[PDB]
Design a protein around this motif. Sequence first.
Motif, PDB file in Angstrom:
ATOM      1  N   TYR A 111       0.863  -1.172   0.000  1.00 50.02           N
ATOM      2  CA  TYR A 111       0.000   0.000   0.000  1.00 50.02           C
ATOM      3  C   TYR A 111       0.900   1.222   0.000  1.00 50.02           C
ATOM      4  CZ  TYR A 111      -2.582   3.895   2.013  1.00 50.02           C
ATOM      5  OH  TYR A 111      -3.068   5.152   2.286  1.00 50.02           O
ATOM      6  N   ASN A 112       0.712   2.061  -1.008  1.00 50.25           N
ATOM      7  CA  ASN A 112       1.371   3.373  -1.079  1.00 50.25           C
ATOM      8  C   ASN A 112       2.875   3.243  -0.903  1.00 50.25           C
ATOM      9  OD1 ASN A 112       1.019   6.157  -1.486  1.00 50.25           O
ATOM     10  ND2 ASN A 112       0.935   6.595   0.689  1.00 50.25           N
ATOM     11  N   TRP A 155      -7.414  -6.023   4.081  1.00 49.69           N
ATOM     12  CA  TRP A 155      -7.665  -4.952   3.128  1.00 49.69           C
ATOM     13  C   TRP A 155      -9.049  -5.133   2.531  1.00 49.69           C
ATOM     14  CZ3 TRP A 155      -3.190  -8.142   2.294  1.00 49.69           C
ATOM     15  CH2 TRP A 155      -3.428  -9.251   1.458  1.00 49.69           C
ATOM     16  N   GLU A 188      -1.186  -4.006  -5.428  1.00 50.05           N
ATOM     17  CA  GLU A 188      -1.632  -2.915  -4.586  1.00 50.05           C
ATOM     18  C   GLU A 188      -2.975  -3.191  -3.948  1.00 50.05           C
ATOM     19  OE1 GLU A 188       0.191  -0.079  -4.373  1.00 50.05           O
ATOM     20  OE2 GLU A 188      -1.134   1.025  -3.051  1.00 50.05           O
ATOM     21  N   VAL A 189      -3.094  -2.859  -2.668  1.00 46.22           N
ATOM     22  CA  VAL A 189      -4.316  -3.009  -1.918  1.00 46.22           C
ATOM     23  C   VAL A 189      -4.577  -1.759  -1.091  1.00 46.22           C
ATOM     24  CG1 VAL A 189      -4.038  -5.562  -1.813  1.00 46.22           C
ATOM     25  CG2 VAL A 189      -3.170  -4.128   0.140  1.00 46.22           C
ATOM     26  N   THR A 190      -5.812  -1.659  -0.599  1.00 48.94           N
ATOM     27  CA  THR A 190      -6.212  -0.609   0.320  1.00 48.94           C
ATOM     28  C   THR A 190      -6.497  -1.183   1.707  1.00 48.94           C
ATOM     29  OG1 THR A 190      -7.068   0.653  -1.489  1.00 48.94           O
ATOM     30  CG2 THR A 190      -7.748   1.267   0.738  1.00 48.94           C
ATOM     31  N   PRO A 191      -5.558  -1.007   2.644  1.00 46.14           N
ATOM     32  CA  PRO A 191      -5.785  -1.572   3.987  1.00 46.14           C
ATOM     33  C   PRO A 191      -6.891  -0.911   4.756  1.00 46.14           C
ATOM     34  CG  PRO A 191      -3.511  -0.843   3.730  1.00 46.14           C
ATOM     35  CD  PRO A 191      -4.245  -0.342   2.560  1.00 46.14           C
ATOM     36  N   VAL A 209      -7.043   3.942   7.246  1.00 46.80           N
ATOM     37  CA  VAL A 209      -7.011   3.986   5.799  1.00 46.80           C
ATOM     38  C   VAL A 209      -8.450   3.822   5.336  1.00 46.80           C
ATOM     39  CG1 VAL A 209      -5.887   3.092   3.726  1.00 46.80           C
ATOM     40  CG2 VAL A 209      -4.561   3.290   5.850  1.00 46.80           C
TER      41      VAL A 209
END
Length: 206
Positions: free
Chosen positions: A10-11, A68, A89-92, A117
């Motif tokens: 992530y990021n 996530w 890529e993931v969004t936690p 997040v």
Amino acid sequence: ESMLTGRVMYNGEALQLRGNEAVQLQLYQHGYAKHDPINVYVNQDGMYSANLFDGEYQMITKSGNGPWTSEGRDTINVTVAGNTVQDVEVTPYYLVRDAQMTLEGNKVNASFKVEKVAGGGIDRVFFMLSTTQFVNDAEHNVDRYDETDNLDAYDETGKLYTFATRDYTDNSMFQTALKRGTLFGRICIWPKGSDQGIYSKVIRLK
């Protein structure tokens, strides 16, 4: 056979996960509809490695598996030609920031800061102690200590969370870890709705 490697991130940063076999990615060779994927495990430091024949693959996270959300979840087209790298890529939901675990005689003091997040609420927070670096929600050969009150009061980026002090005077494994000079710790946030915890890095307390 070639190696496909990469990171769940992530990021720009690999996630801190429960290793072993708890988090899986899926690799499809005959299209998503055929529902026949190859399994790839992600380790505690967010890294995966798969031994594959060269060719074309579609890589995706396993629905509902990992700390996530499904935000941005889609197949990633990968051409394996010799050893090949592909990150995911993931969004936690949350990240564990500024983790600190300090040893004070027979006592441990642990704290951290919340980074929100995706959010959704915090189900539980806990820390783990171990004589080795392989520490997670199930593996913790010295202790695991959970707290579950008032967690909504910490559901905002930047909030400092401090655990109750814990004393390990009669724990033979602890006292041995002290004497051998080998005590490891870790902290976990369990997001509401997640099948998995998100963690701090492993900390060596002694």
